């Protein structure tokens, strides 16, 4: 099947289009779950074809970055340390380590938070928890026509997960703490209503983070 995907990835016009199948995660899963020599080699071949045949720079960056959102580069270093006798493994590992060696710098920004929002993977992650991010960047919640605010608002509107809800309330609390105009922006977006409703959420972690956000929103 990954040989079928490697063959599909021979054309630049196919690599531009194949993105909508969400194929990099399933190859990255097998790349962790299956160290078999053939399987390793044909994933490296498929990943090399996707990235290298992407003549569109956005598509090249997107394949390198999707592999880095799957953290493929660390597994390629594990596979570089693993014993393999084949140059068609070794040289395609080193190729992808170099190209994903670009997009690792893009992801390992504060944008690991941007990707956690974009993917909906809200958690008590180090970049959610650390003050430095908000202290240096909180205003950026307004970027791409308020995209990160719109995500947090939608998650506070329709998420089922009390961690996501409480994380988002914490994110709103630090957003207002580190960007004062952010209070006005949440008040203009009406996002406060979600936080004020989640004061009576069924989870004490949500209720606590909702109250804490109401404190950081209304109290100096």
């Amino acid at each position: 099947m990954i040989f079928s995907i490697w063959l599909l990835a021979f054309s630049p016009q196919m690599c531009e289009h194949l993105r909508r199948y969400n194929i990099i995660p399933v190859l990255s899963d097998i790349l962790q779950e299956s160290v078999k020599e053939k399987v390793t080699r044909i994933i490296l071949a498929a990943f090399r074809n996707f990235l290298e045949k992407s003549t569109e720079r956005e598509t090249r960056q997107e394949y390198a970055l999707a592999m880095i959102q799957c953290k493929v580069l660390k597994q390629l270093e594990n596979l570089e340390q693993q014993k393999y006798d084949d140059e068609d493994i070794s040289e395609d590992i080193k190729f992808l380590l170099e190209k994903l060696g670009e997009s690792v710098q893009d992801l390992s920004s504060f944008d690991e938070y941007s990707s956690e929002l974009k993917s909906g993977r809200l958690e008590w992650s180090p970049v959610h928890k650390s003050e430095k991010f908000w202290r240096e960047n909180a205003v950026r919640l307004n970027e791409k026509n308020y995209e990160l605010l719109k995500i947090l608002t939608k998650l506070l509107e329709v998420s089922d997960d009390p961690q996501v809800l409480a994380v988002a309330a914490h994110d709103v609390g630090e957003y207002v703490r580190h960007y004062p105009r952010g209070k006005r922006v949440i008040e203009q977006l009406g996002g406060k209503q979600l936080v004020m409703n989640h004061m009576h959420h069924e989870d004490q972690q949500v209720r606590y983070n909702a109250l804490l956000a109401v404190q950081k929103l209304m109290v100096h």
Binding site: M199, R207, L211, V214, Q215, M218, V219, H220
Partner: protein, 54 residues
């Protein structure tokens, strides 16, 4: 739990009203101070130009 959250909300309400009263007190004081400063500078500048012309 939830009555004690309402006690904390009442403390927050008291802080909000108190610091709002402090902001009113500060701005009302700084209004009268900057009235004394600005009137005093403005009269004393123009009065002294008139004094030398005559």
């Amino acid at each position: 739990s939830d009555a004690d959250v309402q006690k904390q909300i009442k403390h927050m309400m008291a802080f909000i009203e108190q610091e709002a009263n402090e902001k009113a007190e500060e701005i009302d004081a700084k209004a009268e101070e900057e009235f004394n400063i600005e009137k005093g500078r403005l009269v004393q500048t123009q009065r002294l130009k008139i004094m030398e012309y005559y």
